Amino acid sequence: DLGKKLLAARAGQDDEVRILMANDVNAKITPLHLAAAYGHLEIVEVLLKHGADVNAHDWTPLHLAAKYGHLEIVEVLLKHGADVNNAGKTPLHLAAAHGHLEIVEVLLKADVNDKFGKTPFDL
Amino acid sequence: LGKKLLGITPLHLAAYGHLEIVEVLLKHGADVNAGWTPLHLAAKYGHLEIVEVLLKGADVNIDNAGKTPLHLAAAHGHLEIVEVLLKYGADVNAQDKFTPFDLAIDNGNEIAEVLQKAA
Amino acid sequence: QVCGTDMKLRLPASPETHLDMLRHLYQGCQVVQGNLELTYLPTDASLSFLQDIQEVQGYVLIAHNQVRQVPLQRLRIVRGTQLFEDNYALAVLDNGGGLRELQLRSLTEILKGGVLIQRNPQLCYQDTILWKDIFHKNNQLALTLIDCHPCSPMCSRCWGESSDCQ
Amino acid sequence: GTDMKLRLPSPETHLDMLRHLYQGCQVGNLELTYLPASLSFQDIQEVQGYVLIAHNQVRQVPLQRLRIVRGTQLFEDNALAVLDNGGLRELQLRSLTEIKGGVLIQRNPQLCYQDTILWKDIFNQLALTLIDRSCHPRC
């Protein structure tokens, strides 16, 4: 049952994560959702190196990271074929509702035009 | 701690055939006449070296069976213990509830000659 | 009103006087000021004293039990401070007699911690409840890791078999 | 029988295991501890090993059918061990009439009539006999 011990990535125990991968990176929720949400760059990087789903669905890693404010993580997620655009909400929403200028700027090069007809600009 | 050490005292248990054990048990002031006596056991199991050091406050001449160490030593065929128990002054013609002389003759310990001589 | 255990999966040393300790410990208790751990109890155990408990502040733990029912029917909220295995506000393991139902019809709030139900070859309806509705608004990313008659029509998420509904 | 001495178990199956083990036989060492409980499994007649009762809260141990105790295995290199026992009340034995090994009966507050039976006749004339209480009038 190495899967339970893997989702390690939640607490960011990189040595354990690496000692686990060397012995299912797509176990289910995902390890990548976790690492990206809590903000553990090295973890998400090694995970991707092990062939982890970038567009995995719970919610995406990119959306989570765009919500909790993890810039570098977003920059390594979007640079790996991630959907730049749930409850209707896309990353540009979670970012532009939590005051993330850096995130919104970097992600803008994402459409600006929710299920309530709410654009990120209205948030 | 009185249990870890040990009608049985550490002296009876010393009489296992341990010599040094009785040496230091008696050196530490232990009764030697305390219905068997340590001598009854030491003369039965066949431990000569223990009876030797023992007799030097030990009654030589009875129990629930009425047996004297010469009786059981002659019964189990121990010429040494018999000889030295006699030489320490044992009743050659004592009696039990039901004589060491004949007690040997039932076990084919013809010892008996010594008893049939030193009457 | 207030009362616990922090021994985890520690095999009981006393054993022969276990139910008594737990009994005198939890009777009349309405708020458990710590952890509620139920472990290493035979098929004949009573556990009735639990019908008063309506709030645990730490974690919950029901492991190694040949009992079948755990009358935690008053337990409304588990705070979720002291987390079992660092992320489980409720853990139920190795019950199998054997645990058949975790009658927690009053449970509607878990502030912090995930859920862990494993190795229960007799437990039922533990996969009928929507733990995401119980999970607090901020406890969204909690871990849920979960082998029997359908729940009541009047419910259809269910904890028991009677009309025992969520 | 067993040989785990006074080692803890699966407590929730202790009484079960014991049952499934010793019900309907005539033993090996007799070990039964850490029990708070019906022990009507009363079928034991001879035990080749040592008999032990420890850390109990049972008021009776129906071993009345036990008649002989060979002794091959001894508790602490020295046959019958009862200790730290709500609590035992009587051995209920009686059928015993022949015992290698001795007797050690310690720390049983609710036990009685244990120092009424002579043990020399139940025998090993050099076997240890070490038999508290908080009773009603060879029994």
XYZ file of C-alpha atoms in Angstrom, chain A residues 58-109:
52
model
C -10.054 16.285 -8.651
C -9.656 20.661 -9.736
C -6.188 20.811 -11.296
C -2.705 21.233 -9.805
C -2.390 24.484 -11.769
C -5.672 25.845 -10.388
C -4.710 24.963 -6.804
C -1.255 26.521 -7.138
C -2.882 29.571 -8.730
C -5.196 29.808 -5.720
C -2.692 29.391 -2.883
C -0.087 31.657 -4.484
C 2.782 29.445 -5.624
C 4.379 31.330 -8.516
C 7.308 29.094 -9.500
C 5.106 25.990 -9.239
C 2.624 27.580 -11.635
C 5.493 28.488 -13.948
C 6.681 24.870 -14.080
C 3.139 23.543 -14.395
C 2.004 25.747 -17.292
C 5.324 25.058 -19.024
C 4.294 21.396 -19.124
C 1.183 21.408 -21.310
C -1.147 22.588 -18.553
C -4.631 23.954 -19.175
C -4.213 27.702 -18.698
C -8.011 27.913 -18.806
C -14.380 23.188 -12.062
C -17.258 25.304 -10.790
C -16.762 27.259 -13.992
C -13.693 28.806 -12.379
C -10.359 28.795 -14.218
C -6.884 29.613 -12.790
C -7.168 33.294 -13.893
C -10.169 33.505 -11.513
C -8.617 31.965 -8.353
C -5.589 34.155 -9.077
C -7.527 37.371 -9.787
C -9.712 36.926 -6.704
C -6.851 36.557 -4.240
C -4.787 39.555 -5.337
C -2.044 37.781 -7.273
C -0.514 40.385 -9.594
C 2.537 38.276 -10.470
C 0.378 35.211 -11.130
C -2.223 37.092 -13.185
C 0.504 38.811 -15.220
C 2.488 35.647 -15.925
C -0.711 33.754 -16.755
C -2.115 36.529 -18.965
C 0.253 35.326 -21.689
